[PDB]
Amino acid sequence: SGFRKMAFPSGKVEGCMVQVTCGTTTLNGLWLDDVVYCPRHVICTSEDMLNPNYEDLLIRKSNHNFLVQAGNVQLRVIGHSMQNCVLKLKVDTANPKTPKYKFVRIQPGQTFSVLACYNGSPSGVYQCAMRPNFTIKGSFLNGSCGSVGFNIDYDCVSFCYMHHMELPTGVHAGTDLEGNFYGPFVDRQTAQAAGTDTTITVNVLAWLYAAVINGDRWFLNRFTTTLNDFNLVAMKYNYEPLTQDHVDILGPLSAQTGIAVLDMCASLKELLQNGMNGRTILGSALLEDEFTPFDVVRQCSG
Amino acid sequence: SGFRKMAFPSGKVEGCMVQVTCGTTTLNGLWLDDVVYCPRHVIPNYEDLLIRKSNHNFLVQAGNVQLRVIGHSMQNCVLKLKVDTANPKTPKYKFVRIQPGQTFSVLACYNGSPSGVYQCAMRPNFTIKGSFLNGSCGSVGFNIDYDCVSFCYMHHMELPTGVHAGTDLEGNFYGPFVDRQTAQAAGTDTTITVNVLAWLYAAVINGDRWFLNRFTTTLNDFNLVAMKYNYEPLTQDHVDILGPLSAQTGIAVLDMCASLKELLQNGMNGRTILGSALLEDEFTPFDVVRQCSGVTF
Ligand SMILES: CN1CCc2ccc(Cl)cc2[C@@H]1C(=O)Nc1cncc2ccccc12
Ligand SMILES: [Cl-]
């Protein structure tokens, strides 16, 4: 029993965290095999942040301009290339701690663990979700650039996020490990704003199923709903539209608890109308949306 | 910016997780140097049950490597299994017993394999509100102090309310619990007052000031109110511990206490503090400083 916000064990990722210095800028890199991946904004100066030409800045750099530190060991850069917003630094040593890994691009609503690092040193691990507006609500200070998001399903680390910047609202923007940003963001100091955030409906329903599995049924009702009627109500509370794919994804949890997805949708509709009335669901007074259907099954079974 | 429930990097502890099998029971062990520590319930008169066991009855597995047991001893509710091989991945470590209100990271394991890491606090009732299924017994709680892992918890059991009970690494239980299937209940829980205040300072640091007021309070008046809401008494030591956060935000500890006093009597009124509609009590004053300054391990 119990439901906690749970992160994947960070060990396999800690073994890949290095410090990358270019000029005055110092951030984190991901050392996998003989490549160190880091945000390309490490090559930017003070006046090269509003409108930087990264191809122009990178052509002026040599291998010895990039200082890479793995613990107390200075790694030798033997090549450099840029792939979208990520800088790939070829090094003369393959990381012996390189785990089995994949580069995966995630969709909004997906969750992942973040190993927050400063100067190539891991300081903390937390779980978070890709928000529907493509931002993440992380805990990041200056120097956290290059910190990574991942999932460790089985023995393979799926890298899905590299932290790049903080938006004016305190939310964070970054890229997949191929340098492609999530959302309409660019790696420049220009006026950028996160789109209006919405609640990840499929995740709230999954978390309501997790509560049913843990013996919490106070919120259940005798009603069901059509998918269209649920979406008309959900939209009014800034909830993401629930698609047929989401209903199908919730199938195993529906079978395990005996509560049809559209029946749980009716509980959610009612919670949205009434609030909690001093009650909590899984120790929370708000509807939690950062647990996917896959997370609920994993935590409530193995 | 941002405030998350953050755990210590679990890497140093992952290298120590092994699987311990005795008869039909399989749980986790902590392999430090040439000793594997695990709950004694893996084997009730525990001295009588242990005297009937031989070294070869305990199967210890480190990944796909069987560790041979060369000795066994019991220290309170922990079984110490002497192994032939010293763990090469043994970090710098200490065994520390924590106080209720202190936080730590839990590396949940099933069959000697780490599956998740989460942060939690030792409740004032000595239980942890964890997340554990069958096979999690032997999972450990820890803090990281520079490069030294302070082991503070070993998971033993789940109470009927879904909360958890365990011991320090010397086998001494946290709370009035015993390691057997019997009628055991967690005491009435209380809110960790010093941690709520620290989390209110973390909210101020993140730009959340709606709950601040012009008022202050005496420590005695605050404790008379806090006792009415099932909050732990705030001591002078707590006030002193909150000193750096008070200096950093310019809000005196007793001034923040009057904000907590108004929050207890009046509620949040549809508002949230750090994305929460409840007062969070599982972040200590040190956790807030560490997360709002950036300490690395
Ligand atoms: C240092 N510069 C600032 C401007 C800028 C502009 C564009 C880009 Cl692509 C990156 C940056 C980085 C940055 O945002 N760093 C940060 C990343 N995450 C949390 C931060 C918390 C506070 C301060 C900076 C943070
Ligand atoms: Cl995805």
Q: Which of A3, A11, A144 sits opposite B10 (nearest CB)?
A: A11
B23: left (phi over 0), alpha (psi -120 to 50) or beta: left
State how far the Cα of A258 lies from the Cα of A273, in Å rounded to an integer: 24
**Domains present along chain A, CATH in parentheses:** 1-14+100-197 (2.40.10.10), 15-99 (2.40.10.10), 198-301 (1.10.1840.10)
State how far the Cα of A156 lies from the Cα of B269, in Å rounded to an integer: 45
Question: How far does residue A19's CA lie from ligand 1's centre (Å)?
Answer: 16
The position carrying tokens 């909590």 is A280
* Closest atom of ligand 1 to CA, residue A141: 21
Question: How far does residue A179's CA lie from ligand 1's centre (Å)?
Answer: 16
State how far the Cα of B253 lies from the Cα of B60, in Å rounded to an integer: 50
Q: Which has the closest alpha carbon to B35: B8, B14, B62?
A: B62
For residue B2, what are the CA distances in angstroms to A33, A166, A192, B166, B273?
Answer: 32, 10, 18, 32, 12
For residue B165, what are the CA distances in angstroms to B39, B128, B185?
Answer: 12, 7, 10
| B136 and B116 Cβ atoms separated by less than 8 Å | no
CA distance A123 to chain B (A): 4
Six-digit token pair at A178? 């191929």
Say if the Cβ atoms of B296 and A122 lie within 8 Å: yes
State how far the Cα of B109 lies from the Cα of B130, in Å rounded to an integer: 13
DSSP of chain B: ------BPP-HHHHTTEEEEEETTEEEEEEEETTEEEEEGGG---HHHHHHT--GGGEEEEETTEEEPEEEEEEETTEEEEEESS--TT--EEEE-PPPBTBEEEEEEEETTEEEEEEEEE--TTS-B-----TT-TT-EEEEEETTEEEEEEEEEEE-TTS-EEEE-TTSPBSSS--SSSS---PPPP-B-HHHHHHHHHHHHHTT--TT--S----HHHHHHHHHHTTBPPPPHHHHHHTHHHHHHHT--HHHHHHHHHHHHHH--TT--BTTBSS---S--HHHHHHHTTT---
Q: Which residues from chain B sit within 8 angstroms of residue A283, using beta carbons?
A: 129
β-strand pairing of B113-121 with B103-110: antiparallel
- Find the largest Cα–Cα distance for chain B: 68
State how far the Cα of B96 lies from the Cα of A107, in Å rounded to an integer: 42
Question: How far does residue A206's CA lie from ligand 2's centre (Å)?
Answer: 15
Q: Which has the closest alpha carbon to B145: B296, B292, B33, B17?
A: B296
3-state secondary structure of A174: strand
Six-digit token pair at B282? 């599982």
| A18 and A115 Cβ atoms separated by less than 8 Å | no
Q: Which residues from chain A sit within 8 angstroms of residue B277, using beta carbons?
A: 284-286
Six-digit token pair at A143? 């120097």
Q: Which has the closest alpha carbon to B132: B62, B228, B27?
A: B27
CA distance A55 to chain B (A): 31
State how far the Cα of B112 lies from the Cα of B67, in Å rounded to an integer: 13
- The number of beta carbons lying within 10 Å of the beta carbon of residue A92 is 12
Six-digit token pair at A17? 């965290």
| Contacts by A89-95, CB closer than 8 A, 24 or more apart | A89/A20, A89/A29, A89/A35, A89/A36, A89/A37, A89/A38, A90/A34, A90/A35, A91/A31, A91/A34, A91/A35, A91/A36, A92/A34, A93/A34, A94/A33, A94/A34, A95/A15, A95/A16, A95/A31, A95/A32, A95/A33, A95/A34, A95/A70
B251: left (phi over 0), alpha (psi -120 to 50) or beta: beta
- With CA atoms as reference, the chain A residue closest to B207 would be A170
State how far the Cα of B209 lies from the Cα of B203, in Å rounded to an integer: 7
Q: Which residues from chain B sit within 8 angstroms of residue A286, using beta carbons?
A: 272, 275-277
State how far the Cα of B245 lies from the Cα of A140, in Å rounded to an integer: 19
3-state secondary structure of A128: strand
- Compute, in degrees rounded to 10, the torsion defined by CA atoms B254, B260, B261, B262: 120
For residue B164, what are the CA distances in angstroms to A86, A100, B175?
Answer: 44, 34, 11
Say if the Cβ atoms of A8 and B117 lie within 8 Å: yes
Burial of A276 (0-12, 13-18, 19+ CB in 10 A): middle
* Closest atom of ligand 1 to CA, residue A39: 9
Helix (H) or strand (E) holding A90: strand A86-91
| Contacts by A173-177, CB closer than 8 A, 24 or more apart | A173/A134, A173/A135, A173/A136, A174/A39, A174/A136, A174/A149, A175/A39, A175/A84, A175/A85, A175/A86, A176/A103, A176/A104, A176/A105, A176/A106, A177/A30, A177/A37, A177/A86, A177/A103, A177/A148
A141 lines ligand 1 (CB under 6 A): yes
State how far the Cα of B194 lies from the Cα of B177, in Å rounded to an integer: 25
CA distance A143 to chain B (A): 9
Bridge partner residues of B81 (DSSP):
B36, B72
The one catalytic residue in A16, A22, A38, A41 is A41
Whose CA is closest to atom 11 on ligand 1? A165
Question: How far does residue B108's CA lie from ligand 2's centre (Å)?
Answer: 24
State how far the Cα of B210 lies from the Cα of A180, in Å rounded to an integer: 38
Say if the Cβ atoms of B296 and A125 lie within 8 Å: no
A187 lines ligand 1 (CB under 6 A): yes
For residue B67, what are the CA distances in angstroms to A215, B53, B64, B82, B97?
Answer: 40, 17, 10, 10, 28
| B191 and B229 Cβ atoms separated by less than 8 Å | yes
For residue B268, what are the CA distances in angstroms to A210, B261, B276, B279?
Answer: 26, 12, 10, 9
Q: Which residues contact A161 (CB under 8 A, 6 or more apart)?
A: A106, A112, A114, A130, A136, A148, A149, A150, A174, A175, A176, A177, A182
- Compute, in degrees rounded to 10, the torsion defined by CA atoms A63, A67, A70, A71: 160
Question: How far does residue A166's CA lie from ligand 1's centre (Å)?
Answer: 5
- Give strand ranges (E) for A93-145: 100-103, 111-118, 121-129
| B199 and B274 Cβ atoms separated by less than 8 Å | yes
* Closest atom of ligand 1 to CA, residue A186: 9
Amino acid at A138: G
- Note the resolution in Å, 1 decimal: 2.2
In b/e form, how buried is each residue of A160-192, taking b as 16+ CB within 10 angstroms? Answer: bbbbbbbbeebbbbbbbbebebbbebebbeeee
| Stated length of chain B | 297
Q: Which residues from chain A sit within 8 angstroms of residue B4, using beta carbons?
A: 126, 128, 137-139
State how far the Cα of A251 lies from the Cα of A258, in Å rounded to an integer: 10
Helix (H) or strand (E) holding A31: strand A25-32
A13: left (phi over 0), alpha (psi -120 to 50) or beta: alpha
Gyration radius of chain B's alpha carbons: 21
Say if the Cβ atoms of A286 and B276 lie within 8 Å: yes
| A282 and A214 Cβ atoms separated by less than 8 Å | yes
CA distance A209 to chain B (A): 16
β-strand pairing of A17-22 with A25-32: antiparallel
Best mutation site among A142, A161, A175 for ligand 1 pocket (most ligand atoms within 8 Å of CB): A142
Say if the Cβ atoms of A126 and B14 lie within 8 Å: no
| Stated length of chain A | 302
| A161 and A138 Cβ atoms separated by less than 8 Å | no
Sign of CA dihedral A81, A87, A88, A94: positive
Q: Which residues contact A158 (CB under 8 A, 6 or more apart)?
A: A101, A102, A103, A104, A150, A151, A152
* Closest atom of ligand 1 to CA, residue A85: 9
| B190 and B100 Cβ atoms separated by less than 8 Å | no
- Compute, in degrees rounded to 10, the torsion defined by CA atoms A209, A215, A221, A223: 40
A144 lines ligand 1 (CB under 6 A): yes
Say if the Cβ atoms of B110 and A302 lie within 8 Å: yes
Say if the Cβ atoms of B278 and A284 lie within 8 Å: yes
3-state secondary structure of A204: helix
For residue A253, what are the CA distances in angstroms to A243, A249, A286, A294, A296?
Answer: 16, 9, 21, 10, 9
State how far the Cα of B89 lies from the Cα of B290, in Å rounded to an integer: 26
Q: Which residues from chain A sit within 8 angstroms of residue B275, using beta carbons?
A: 137, 286
From first CA to last CA, the distance across chain A in angstroms is 12
Q: Which residues contact B134 (CB under 8 A, 6 or more apart)?
A: none
Distance of CA A36 to the CA centre of its chain: 20
| A9 and A152 Cβ atoms separated by less than 8 Å | yes
β-strand pairing of B69-75 with A86-91: unpaired
